[PDB]
Write a protein that binds this ligand. Structure first.
Ligand SMILES: [Ca+2]
Ligand SMILES: [Ca+2]
Ligand SMILES: [Ca+2]
Ligand SMILES: [Ca+2]
Ligand SMILES: [Ca+2]
Ligand SMILES: [Ca+2]
Ligand SMILES: [Ca+2]
Ligand SMILES: [Ca+2]
Lengths: 173, 173
């Protein structure tokens, strides 16, 4: 039943070219946030959505196919539940003191230095991160751990990255 | 005279913390585009501006100091002139056939594969790129070349990193 329902959701979202564009993704995510008054956001904007699609577009078609979209969408569902669970003051936002528990719950165990860098790059002047910023961050963070793992074939925790690979991974993002 | 005028522009823009925030950068860049009706754009948005500030924030204060802002602003000026020069049909946008000349004029030599990625990430469905997208792309592209070259002083074409280093280098919206 869930497999059939998800297939229908994808079919209706993707439309006539059978892939999910940045605009299509933006529009469905903004529909989600309308339904959840407990998620504070200024909206998912197009630039943020083009970045999400690029970092998830493993076959470089420009758009998200069934499996690419499935991976992203199920992550967003999980991360949404986490954001609500770790917003322990109901601000509708994740503050700097809430952030480590939320990221750790999502399987990302970072250190103070890296949390500080995340807050600086993604959170506002008060140290608060809203829903679109949080989802944009996690999608990227997950992709960057996955890219590292794919290059660390010998399991040493060091990767060698050539210039071409570097430009692909940073620019198509 | 121009040194004095630029110092005044920065002082008035940066205000009471003497650094330029993503919001302050957004506001001045949108003022620029108002003055140049020959540059087509849907505006500089906040997410794009937060990314620009982060990639330019080499002393990790969160905002752009005098020298950081000077380096960014002078790049934007050069790239704006290039955009007008390589828009050889006066559309107010850079098409896929105008892009290589514009990037080459800005010093960047990329393979066909990378251009295809950049056009998918930054250009519209017709292959046309607007002004904010063009500037956002070049600021990132320049930053990513500088980051890599700093870590490959030898010119091996390869860098070695651990996960912390990787995430510091790549966690840029
Ligand atoms: Ca579609
Ligand atoms: Ca794809
Ligand atoms: Ca909260
Ligand atoms: Ca936001
Ligand atoms: Ca300021
Ligand atoms: Ca700074
Ligand atoms: Ca043109
Ligand atoms: Ca634009």
């Amino acid at each position: 039943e869930e497999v059939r329902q998800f297939r229908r959701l994808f079919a209706q979202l993707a439309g006539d070219d059978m892939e999910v564009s940045a605009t299509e993704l933006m529009n469905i995510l903004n529909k989600v946030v309308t339904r959840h008054p407990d998620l504070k956001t200024d909206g998912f904007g197009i630039d943020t959505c083009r970045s999400m699609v690029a970092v998830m577009d493993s076959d470089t078609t420009g758009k998200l196919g069934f499996e690419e979209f499935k991976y992203l969408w199920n992550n967003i569902k999980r991360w949404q539940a986490i954001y609500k669970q770790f917003d322990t003051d109901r601000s509708g936002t994740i503050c700097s003191s809430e952030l480590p528990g939320a990221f750790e719950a999502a399987g990302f165990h970072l250190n103070e230095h890296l949390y500080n860098m995340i807050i600086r790059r993604y959170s506002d002047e008060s140290g608060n991160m809203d829903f679109d910023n949080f989802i944009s961050c996690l999608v990227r963070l997950d992709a960057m751990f996955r890219a590292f793992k794919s290059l660390d074939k010998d399991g040493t925790g060091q990767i060698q990255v050539n210039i071409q690979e570097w430009l692909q991974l940073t620019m198509y993002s």
